[PDB]
Scaffold this active site. Structure first.
Site, PDB file in Angstrom:
ATOM      1  N   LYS A   1      40.497  40.482  42.532  1.00  0.00           N
ATOM      2  CA  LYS A   1      40.853  41.367  43.623  1.00  0.00           C
ATOM      3  C   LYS A   1      42.258  41.058  44.092  1.00  0.00           C
ATOM      4  O   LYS A   1      42.660  39.896  44.169  1.00  0.00           O
ATOM      5  CB  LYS A   1      39.865  41.240  44.767  1.00  0.00           C
TER       6      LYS A   1
ATOM      7  N   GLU B   1      21.877  44.220  56.558  1.00  0.00           N
ATOM      8  CA  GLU B   1      21.592  44.271  57.984  1.00  0.00           C
ATOM      9  C   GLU B   1      20.112  44.077  58.258  1.00  0.00           C
ATOM     10  O   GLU B   1      19.730  43.615  59.337  1.00  0.00           O
ATOM     11  CB  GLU B   1      22.080  45.591  58.564  1.00  0.00           C
TER      12      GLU B   1
ATOM     13  N   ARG C   1      21.088  50.646  59.053  1.00  0.00           N
ATOM     14  CA  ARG C   1      20.658  50.013  57.817  1.00  0.00           C
ATOM     15  C   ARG C   1      19.399  49.186  58.040  1.00  0.00           C
ATOM     16  O   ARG C   1      18.613  48.961  57.114  1.00  0.00           O
ATOM     17  CB  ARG C   1      21.792  49.151  57.269  1.00  0.00           C
TER      18      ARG C   1
END
Lengths: 92, 584, 584
Positions: free
Chosen positions: B240, B326, B354
């Site tokens: 990344k 979550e 979520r």
């Protein structure tokens, strides 16, 4: 990618555990039955299962690491890439 | 320095290109993405590592022949570039412009509008079996990162895919386990450091290097035309931040990078006058974590976006990393809340849904002591409605046993944390927006004064007309008077910070005193306006006959862009609030 | 034939027992559970296979020394027996009696009140790290079945557990992959036919045979005192229905077995006069599945509980099994809804919140065509509030782009399915209760007449007073007049089946015509009453000055028991509705 699998299974039953590490097929019969000798303990825990590890690259034989047959089954065998990569099955 | 890219506006242009020139093209892509993001707000480092992949899966698979599926959409920059949206990058993330994520309702190739992690591979499997049911013979590719490998939808959908043997494609990312997160993660906790998905039934190629377009093109064309049988998953090695030597070692440090100097990575330090609420929270929670034993915060990888790094390394054993799940968190909260602890959750107002199951069942039916910090309240600004958490006051405040609180500034922010860490007979929740205020210092500087549970707060004096609200809204309510206060202060403002249990005393006093009342909130219409009138109704037998109009998020999804105009769009710039009373 | 069991009322009694007598005790348990369940409503076959385990983990681990965690709670019958609740079984599932699932707020050993699948292992990990944070040295055991292995919370929490190395216990069940489902699954699709979750970081013992108490006692005492380091998972072989030769081949056929003949398994066939809505749905959906190509239903293993077996084997390729993962479904819906298909979801009103994320983002932001069948609306009756889906009108109807509809009987049930299968420009949802009505036959017998989207339905004539509502409520509204209709028909009843978009024309007509109005709904206060007054407010400028009191589910969780008294408890027997207007 490369193929790896460890079996924590403290007291891996001595009923049936197997290892076979070819090209992109692999049978890793990791099993905790405890059917008569739980680890050494009294138990009629009739069980039935083994483990399968196919592979989405024909598992070549560069680096192999193995620690197994008593309480763990652990194997690492390599490859990387192309020509029909499938794991757990090669469906038609 | 981008020769080949001024020629392509769809993959048909590059269909015959060669791999040697493919690499140069990918490099031009790195450079173009850097020059575009240096305008504003681009989730850089992922897309920087993703350029390679974007090239590969736009070259091999044709669109809208092949329904390609990306992850949350942060790394959709190269994709957009190669999909007739290179010339729009100077307008991405702006008003009327492009969303920072794939948005199905934009272009024929915008396959399925993402915006939440792991919410894709399921839809990709869905398109796969659907096209096999319409007889069509296409390829459906789902690209995700390890950041989407943690959540539940991914695991369940991918297991079910490996079961159905529906011909489909999955793509995992980031071999080095640096994640692909939610939009507004400013920074995760930096770590110092084979994926057996055969029990999930799929086919798992990779992680191959996502830094040589030669590799990927020699894959998707070589094996994964529709001759592929069943589902396949593609992990990919991706550094990344690849292509930008600053972020190459500073990815998260340029992940959500603001308009930066393309030569040094310089960013704007102008925000050092007033800090964000997310900083105003972890700055402050430590003022209760030092004086208390079992105060623990819970977060789903929204650390930077919640500032809770001010909390983690300070108390290396009272801040927990659960990945982006979550659901697993909100019970891991309650699972700690039964040990007499006081574990308290920091999770974005949108990202709560979520887990809305556990908040309903595993907590409020257990009455366990879990306090929630609903970050990113309502209008998130420049990330599109795929983060507009304008439902928190709706889905939470309907539950019995749950207390709903929302600040007005940094003071009320921590004037209430002194409460919701004090109380542990039940759960509670914090609805704080994203932005700024006027903040007196820590309870050192007298801000940690707990306040009576269910007690409102009159913030202004005004008798011909009332006004209510909370979250960012009361600041706007303050701002609402700017064209109102000069009218004899018709307006009073009451930040009734408690949404439930409501300050039933305050509202009642407010009721008979004024002849009109207007609530306001940063949520859809199932929340404050609903509860207040629900309470207004039953209390109404003392003349619940005053005009009342809840200026809530109108029934629509407000797009990305400038928060000020989002207020103007959503009818929440003070004038809108102003106009409401003006009709009366 | 139960010698040993009349002696035990807590595990301390059996601490010194031997394995030979342990087996006889387990057998006595089978017999006692059978004699108890033969009173009413016991989720039998699991607990029948679970007796063994219950014995083991009440003998080895002490409670409340060791916080044991079961699954959803259906197989909690032996546990309750061995935890001072053998003598209460003739009152389980009844009013004022025991819940059919583990309920934390009942007894000191009721560790964490379950009621939703997979919602436990997370709380078990939570208790594990919490007790390691309070310095305590206990054991925390989480028992679940393969039925809880599919969902997301399980996967994410167990991965995070294997990460944290928190000393904890997990227990998987049902080696033969017959599931451990939700409460009201009447029957799943019968199949004709391991984990290696060490990659998730756990320790995975089993599936050992859960049919010799000798085996398990020689395990939990032998290795899994606190000397155990980190998390461990225990799969177990369990022949669901073990111990009852009828269910031994008819487990699902005696899983949710009504009060049955303990000698033949005979159950009550008296319900063959009027069928349930869940039957009234799959009976009817085929009347649209035959005449249409891409009508597909989606269910998360609630087949029997939704009757959709009338749909599956009829169209073996238009009904899909996703396991119990409401999230993966609702997008697998949308993921099909983008193929121009019309895939439509049947998921319980409570069990939707498991997926409220995707309904908010992955559908309504995509405006994809997914119709929802929110089964088990609100008051589920004899299964406790852990299924009281009285939020569906709240969390759904707040969304833009979603249409909310609820029937009145079997006619309106399918008078609307002819609509919500007709429309595919957007999503919609069905809120039908569980029970009975008065049902004219299929659209053959003229019931599949689609009705105008957003059009209400006046069901009675009455002008001094109004009345609204939907779901099961309008039948009760009909029933509301029974003590009202004899008053000159002050009451009119309007099943305004559309919750959003509301029949803004009807309500308006209703408004000025009457001087009073009373809505009613089977949901918490964030739904119809909220939306109607929200619409009443803005429309109010034409005198929104009529008394209005939404008799919704009061802010409390209504327990298990008789549905009629649940109405009486929740203030929803017609007299309650009646009394409301009577004050006026």
């Amino acid at each position: 990618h490369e193929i790896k699998m460890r079996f924590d299974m403290p007291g891996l039953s001595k009923e049936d555990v197997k290892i076979s590490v070819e090209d992109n097929v692999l049978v890793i019969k990791g099993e905790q039955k405890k059917e008569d000798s739980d680890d050494s303990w009294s138990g009629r825990s009739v069980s039935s299962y083994g483990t399968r590890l196919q592979l989405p690259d024909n598992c070549e034989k560069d680096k192999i690491k193995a620690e197994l047959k008593n309480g763990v089954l652990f194997i690492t065998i390599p490859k990387t890439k192309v020509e029909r990569k499938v794991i757990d099955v090669q469906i038609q | 320095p981008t020769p080949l890219l001024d020629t392509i506006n769809y993959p048909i242009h590059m269909k015959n290109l060669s791999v040697k020139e493919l690499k140069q093209l990918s490099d031009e892509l790195r450079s173009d993405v850097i020059f575009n993001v240096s305008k504003t707000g681009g989730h850089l480092g992922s897309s920087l590592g993703v350029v390679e992949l974007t090239v590969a899966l736009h070259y091999i698979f044709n669109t809208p022949q092949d329904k390609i599926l990306w992850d949350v959409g942060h790394q959709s920059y190269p994709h957009k570039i190669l999909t007739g949206r290179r010339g729009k990058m100077p307008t991405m993330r702006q008003t009327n412009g492009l969303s920072g994520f794939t948005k199905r309702g934009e272009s024929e190739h915008d396959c399925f509008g993402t915006g939440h992690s792991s919410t894709t591979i399921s839809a990709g499997l869905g398109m796969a079996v659907g096209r096999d049911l319409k007889g069509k013979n296409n390829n459906v590719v789902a690209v995700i990162g390890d950041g989407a490998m943690t959540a539940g939808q991914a695991y369940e959908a991918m297991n079910n895919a490996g079961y159905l043997d529906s011909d489909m494609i999955v793509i995992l990312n980031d071999n080095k386990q640096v994640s692909l997160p939610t939009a507004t993660l400013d920074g995760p906790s930096p770590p110092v450091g084979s994926s057996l998905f055969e029990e999930l039934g799929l086919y798992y190629i990779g992680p191959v290097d996502g830094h040589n377009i030669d590799d990927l093109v020699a894959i998707l064309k070589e094996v994964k035309s529709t001759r592929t049988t069943g589902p396949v998953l593609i992990h990919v090695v991706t550094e990344k931040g690849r292509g930008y030597p600053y972020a190459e070692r500073a990815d998260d440090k340029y992940h959500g990078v603001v308009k930066f100097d393309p030569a040094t990575g310089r960013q704007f330090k102008t925000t050092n006058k007033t800090q964000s609420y997310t900083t105003y929270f972890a700055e402050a929670l430590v003022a209760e974590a030092e004086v208390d034993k079992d105060v623990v915060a819970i977060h789903a990888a929204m650390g930077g976006g919640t500032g809770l790094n001010l909390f983690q390394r300070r108390f290396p054993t009272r801040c927990f990393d659960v990945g982006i799940a979550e659901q697993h968190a909100v019970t891991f909260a309650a699972g700690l809340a039964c040990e007499g602890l006081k574990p308290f959750c920091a999770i974005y107002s949108s990202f709560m849904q979520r887990a809305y199951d556990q908040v309903v069942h595993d907590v409020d039916l257990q009455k366990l002591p879990v306090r929630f910090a609903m970050d990113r309240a309502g209008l998130v600004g420049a990330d599109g409605p795929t983060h507009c958490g304008a439902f928190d006051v709706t889905f939470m405040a309907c539950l019995p046993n749950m207390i709903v609180m929302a600040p007005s500034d940094e003071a009320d922010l921590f004037n209430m944390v002194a409460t919701a860490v004090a109380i542990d007979d039940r759960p509670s929740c914090f609805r704080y927006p994203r932005g700024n205020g006027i903040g007196v210092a820590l309870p050192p500087g007298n801000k940690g004064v707990p306040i009576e549970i269910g007690k409102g707060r009159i913030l202004k004096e005004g008798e011909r007309v009332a006004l209510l609200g909370y979250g960012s809204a009361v600041q706007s309510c303050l701002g609402a008077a700017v064209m109102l206060e000069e009218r004899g202060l018709n307006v009073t403002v009451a930040d009734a910070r408690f949404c439930k249990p409501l300050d039933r005393a305050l509202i009642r006093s407010l009721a008979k005193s004024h002849e009109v009342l207007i609530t306001v909130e940063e949520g859809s219409i199932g929340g404050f306006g609903s509860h207040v009138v629900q309470f207004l109704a039953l209390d109404g037998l003392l003349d619940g006959k005053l005009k009342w109009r809840p200026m809530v998020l109108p029934d629509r999804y407000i797009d990305h862009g400038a928060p000020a105009d989002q207020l103007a769009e959503a009818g929440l710039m003070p004038s809108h609030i102003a106009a409401t009373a003006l009709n009366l």
